[PDB]
């Protein structure tokens, strides 16, 4: 009998407030999946109106579009490398409790109102800090389904990536030259190269360290407060009726979670049609999204229940549940089934072989031995 604990979907925490995010480190991932502490992968936003009037197509270039390995991307290698560096020049272990990618937190936070996909997540209680990542067998199964997922969704994903590529620059605008500015359409898009940041945050009394994907900075890198100039780019089908508006509202809820988990101020969408032609682009502010949603003249307020506040309370309850439920050196399998629609399932694993292989897959050996060396040097002070 493997121990299982149940969290109802309706659970809320009244005293849930989130600390202000704060970047502590950043990484640049090259094509060879190697993580470095620099800003080579950083790009700079640039998109005047004339390009919008040019009616840029997005499907162009999809033939030679690369793709990345899901397991390789889901690896906690860059986050753990940054954490190791932070502890190395710090000389002591951090106060963080939960370490994970931003996508997992977004998925689990959107569950009370956006839970139409199933997932299996791994919890590793190593050195008193829970490390969260996707289940590798679940990742392989999802890869199988994605390979058997037609090509329209691939077309949409490439449209998003192409829109991101068409509105970014390798260097700040003054340093660029005409040839590299106007040769963006000739670039080979790929989902491997990316730039991300490591942000310290947390709800209630828990310090949480997470990382996520950052599209580009606004116009230059503000070393004093990088989080202020950051901006992410997204694509959505153009809206023409009320149902389109409702789907857009759901997309905004998801994206607002996606963003507010990192506190990026601005949001940009590319409004493309069914022909992968960018029609319009409009911006948003992260804090203004809930008020804008609730103040809709088309549909004033069928219900006054604030989805965002309930989501925040639920996320705080989930964080407290994760903190209390698992003790040191305990591995728990976390997953959700769409057929449930009632609550969340969290179970422990007792197979020693399974525990060992999960731990090895999640945590690299060099990080483990470095942490052991840090622990020994703590007694060597």
């Amino acid at each position: 009998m493997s121990k299982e604990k149940i969290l109802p979907l309706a659970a809320r925490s009244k005293k849930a407030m989130l600390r202000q995010p704060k970047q502590v480190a950043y990484f640049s991932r090259d094509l060879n999946y190697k993580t470095h502490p620099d800003r080579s992968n950083l790009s700079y936003y640039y998109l005047p109106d004339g390009d919008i009037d040019n009616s840029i197509d997005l499907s162009v270039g999809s033939k030679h579009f690369l793709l990345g390995d899901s397991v390789e991307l889901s690896k906690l290698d860059p986050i753990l490398l940054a954490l190791k560096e932070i502890e190395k020049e710090s000389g002591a272990k951090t106060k963080d409790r939960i370490i994970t990618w931003r996508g997992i937190m977004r998925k689990l936070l959107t569950l009370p109102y956006d839970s139409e996909e199933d997932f299996v997540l791994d919890v590793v209680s190593f050195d008193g800090q829970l490390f969260i990542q996707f289940n590798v067998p679940y990742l392989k199964s999802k890869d199988v389904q994605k390979q058997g997922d037609t090509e329209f969704h691939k077309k949409l994903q490439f449209s998003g990536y192409k829109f991101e590529k068409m509105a970014t620059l390798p260097k700040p605008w003054p340093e660029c030259t005409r040839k590299e500015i106007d040769s963006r359409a000739k670039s080979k898009c790929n989902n491997i190269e990316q730039y991300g940041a490591i942000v310290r945050t947390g709800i209630s009394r828990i310090k949480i360290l997470i990382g996520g994907a950052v599209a580009c900075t606004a116009d230059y890198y503000d070393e004093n407060d990088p989080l202020s100039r950051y901006i992410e780019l997204k694509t959505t089908r153009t809206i023409n009726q009320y149902k389109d508006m409702i789907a857009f509202e759901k997309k905004l809820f998801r994206t607002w979670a996606q963003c507010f988990l990192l506190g990026i101020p601005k949001i940009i969408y590319g409004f493309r049609d069914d022909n992968c032609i960018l029609r319009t682009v409009e911006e948003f502010s992260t804090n203004d999204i809930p008020l804008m949603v609730k103040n809709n003249p088309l549909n004033e307020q069928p219900k006054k229940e604030n989805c965002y506040m309930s989501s925040i309370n639920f996320y705080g309850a989930v964080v407290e549940w994760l903190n209390e439920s698992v003790k040191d050196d305990q591995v728990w399998k976390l997953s959700y089934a769409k057929r449930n629609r009632q609550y969340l399932v969290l179970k422990e694993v007792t197979d020693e072989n399974e525990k060992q292989q999960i731990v090895d897959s999640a945590i690299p050996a060099w990080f483990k031995e470095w942490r052991s060396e840090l622990r020994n040097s703590e007694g060597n002070i």
Binding site: V60, K63, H64, L66, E151, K188
Partner: protein
């Protein structure tokens, strides 16, 4: 529009790095799928005889394989594959560093898109001599 070898030869001589010409030639090849062996023979001869336009031919073959899978044209895949590795053998020696870089990029592109069979994949890496 009847199919003939001279038209295919002229179109092959008409490739350019611009994507519009390449996709138009691919559409022309699509329209004459009945005489595909002649098409692949002409393509192999021209690519073995061309000097600089090798990359355009590689792009054309890649895209045509792509919409052949989109159009479920199974015979096209092995139809090019019968001569693709040897063609790469004749293409490699007279081809410059940036073009090996882009060629191996596109080779990974074929490999990761489930385009070809495993034996063909392995013979493609032995074709690239790397």
């Amino acid at each position: 529009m009847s199919y003939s070898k001279d038209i295919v030869l002229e179109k092959l001589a008409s490739l350019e790095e611009t994507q519009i010409s390449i996709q138009s030639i691919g559409q022309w090849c699509l329209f004459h799928h009945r005489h595909a062996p002649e098409t692949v023979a002409i393509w192999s001869e021209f690519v073995g005889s061309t000097q600089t336009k090798k990359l355009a031919g590689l792009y054309l073959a890649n895209e045509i394989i792509q919409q052949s899978r989109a159009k479920r044209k199974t015979t096209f895949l092995d139809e090019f594959a019968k001569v693709l590795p040897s063609t790469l053998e004749q293409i490699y020696p007279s081809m410059i560093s940036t073009h090996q870089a882009k060629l191996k990029r596109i080779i990974d592109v074929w490999s990761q898109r489930k385009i070809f069979d495993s034996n063909l994949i392995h013979r493609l890496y032995q074709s690239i001599q790397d």
